[PDB]
Symmetry: C3
Subunit: 114 residues, 3 copies
């Protein structure tokens, strides 16, 4: 799976280890070995949410399976909790788009998972 | 909805209130409340369009509904117009990918919109 | 088509002409004129793959058609090979998401390809 977070919070505010925490937490949440989890954090972004420049985050979670109505409502709680505590971002200023990818459309190690 | 623009244009070229203008313009075009409209601008990017490094932009508009053939043509005219006027990017060097998201795949404030 | 690569490799490690090679190689690979190919490289990113901060990359290839089972495997071998040879990134530390876009969902030059 892949989790990406874009935020206007400054780099100095992203704790070292936030990537590893996300990796471990998502591995448990998606029931997959942490080795398959990739995380990407992009701070100091020029963004607005509701026309306001207060801390916010635009994120995405891509995974081959393990995505759905119920699982997604669950991930939102996990991720908003992490963004709230580690990045000081209010939960109502967080968007997380979920993508259930076909193995044929995920390239890795010179091939695809199909 | 969420609008993101990645461009090689320098940060300094981004006029003040640009994020607010995008928010306001998209509120009108999509008919959705500005309170839930997110905008993200990423300048100084290393990119090429047609192999050329002249001003260009790669954008995306995600929305739950309000996406379609006719509406997308209208959004493109609006957004390309804004990029040309405000960022001095020629419309023929702009790509905008549109995404109609299922409510169940849009996470926000510890849940999804489904 | 559009190819995006996000990586933790430093900007100074990207060889001169990398965007040109991608443009040229992707045009050949997808069969589309290089004029229609856009490339975006984002180095110095804060990311991890498998909980490791070693060189890695998260990429995406969007195209109207020219995407499928066999084609994606071919694109992956091509792209992972380039990232390995030019950026020194191990192929098993690269993810490439493929997207077959509907023409109506791709804006350009004040309109859409629909
Ligand atoms: Cl996955
Ligand atoms: Cl820290
Ligand atoms: Cl589910
Ligand atoms: Cl897919
Ligand atoms: Cl494989
Ligand atoms: Cl929406
Ligand atoms: Cl969706
Ligand atoms: Cl295309
Ligand atoms: Cl280059
Ligand atoms: Cl194919
Ligand atoms: Cl093929
Ligand atoms: Cl599409």
């Amino acid at each position: 799976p892949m989790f990406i977070v874009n935020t206007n919070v400054p780099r100095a505010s992203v704790p070292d280890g936030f990537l590893s925490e996300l990796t471990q937490q998502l591995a448990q949440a998606t029931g997959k070995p942490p080795q398959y989890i990739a995380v990407h954090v992009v701070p100091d972004q020029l963004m607005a949410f509701g026309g306001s420049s207060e801390p916010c985050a635009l994120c995405s979670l891509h995974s081959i399976g393990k995505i759905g109505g119920a699982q997604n409502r669950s991930y939102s709680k996990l991720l908003c909790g992490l963004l709230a505590e580690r990045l000081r971002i209010s939960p109502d200023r967080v968007y997380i788009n979920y993508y259930d990818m076909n193995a044929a459309n995920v390239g890795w190690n010179n091939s695809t998972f199909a």
